[PDB]
Amino acid sequence: TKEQRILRYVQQNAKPGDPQSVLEAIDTYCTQKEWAMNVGDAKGQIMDAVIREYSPSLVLELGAYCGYSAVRMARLLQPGARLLTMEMNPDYAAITQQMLNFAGLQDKVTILNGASQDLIPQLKKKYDVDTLDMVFLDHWKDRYLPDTLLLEKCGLLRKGTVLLADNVIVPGTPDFLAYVRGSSSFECTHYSSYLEYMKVVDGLEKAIYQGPS
Ligand SMILES: Nc1ncnc2c1ncn2[C@@H]1O[C@H](C[C@@H](N)CC[C@H](N)C(=O)O)[C@@H](O)[C@H]1O
Ligand SMILES: Cc1ccc(C(=O)c2cc(O)c(O)c([N+](=O)[O-])c2)cc1
Numbered sequence: 022t023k024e025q026r027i028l029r030y031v032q033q034n035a036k037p038g039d040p041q042s043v044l045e046a047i048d049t050y051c052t053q054k055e056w057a058m059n060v061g062d063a064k065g066q067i068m069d070a071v072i073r074e075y076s077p078s079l080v081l082e083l084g085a086y087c088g089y090s091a092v093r094m095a096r097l098l099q100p101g102a103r104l105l106t107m108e109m110n111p112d113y114a115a116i117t118q119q120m121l122n123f124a125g126l127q128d129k130v131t132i133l134n135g136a137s138q139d140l141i142p143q144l145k146k147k148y149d150v151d152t153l154d155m156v157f158l159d160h161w162k163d164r165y166l167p168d169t170l171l172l173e174k175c176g177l178l179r180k181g182t183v184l185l186a187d188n189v190i191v192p193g194t195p196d197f198l199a200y201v202r203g204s205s206s207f208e209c210t211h212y213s214s215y216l217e218y219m220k221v222v223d224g225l226e227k228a229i230y231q232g233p234s
């Protein structure tokens with residue numbers, strides 16, 4: 022699989038325990054060989070900036086894929102900070118674990134195998150989560166708005182919870198974007214960038230939760 026290819030390429034070309042080289046090898050391969058839906062370096066640098074700004078103790082990632090953004094975020098996590106990541110594809114999830122294992126980041130991260138819509142309502146229950154400091158939305162684009170409503174519904178957001186959504190321009194999340202921008206429950210900021218491994222304009226939206234009406 023494409024994802025085996027990427028994992029193996031990292032195992033051979035990256036340095037173990039070094040999250041940077043992991044990222045850089047993942048990027049080199051997808052730039053030069055096989056495009057992959059990693060958030061990539063350009064948008065990733067904006068993620069980095071947002072993570073460094075808010076120093077979340079608990080991040081929820083929707084869509085882990087090969088672990089590129091999990092590695093990207095986890096390396097910036099403070100001591101004791103936890104990243105939780107949801108990945109419904111068991112193959113992808115096994116790849117993500119291997120990547121995070123290789124990055125020495127496996128202790129900061131918990132991989133949840135399942136659909137976000139299924140896993141979100143059990144977060145407090147099974148995973149000892151009160152509320153989320155930060156959420157990275159990067160799974161199927163039709164799930165951004167529904168999983169936001171679900172996260173809100175399940176009491177997983179607090180005042181100042183940061184939602185950071187990838188691909189709000191391409192492939193695009195128009196309903197989500199319309200919703201957070203229009204709602205008083207969310208203060209939004211758009212970060213214009215580029216689709217990973219091409220000249221297509223894409224962006225990240227930061228949507229900070231304000232609490233209910
Ligand atoms: N509803 C869902 N629940 C959990 N995982 C999902 C869901 N929909 C899509 N996914 C996974 O989300 C991933 C989407 C990727 N763009 C994630 C990339 C990853 N955030 C990265 O930049 O490294 C795929 O690997 C999907 O299998
Ligand atoms: C068939 C197809 C079409 C468009 C893309 C695509 O561009 C893309 C980019 C992402 O950052 C991303 O997160 C996802 N995703 O999870 O669906 C898709 C990728 C594949």
Ligand SMILES: [Mg+2]
Pocket residue numbers: 058059060159187188
């Ligand atoms: Mg994406």
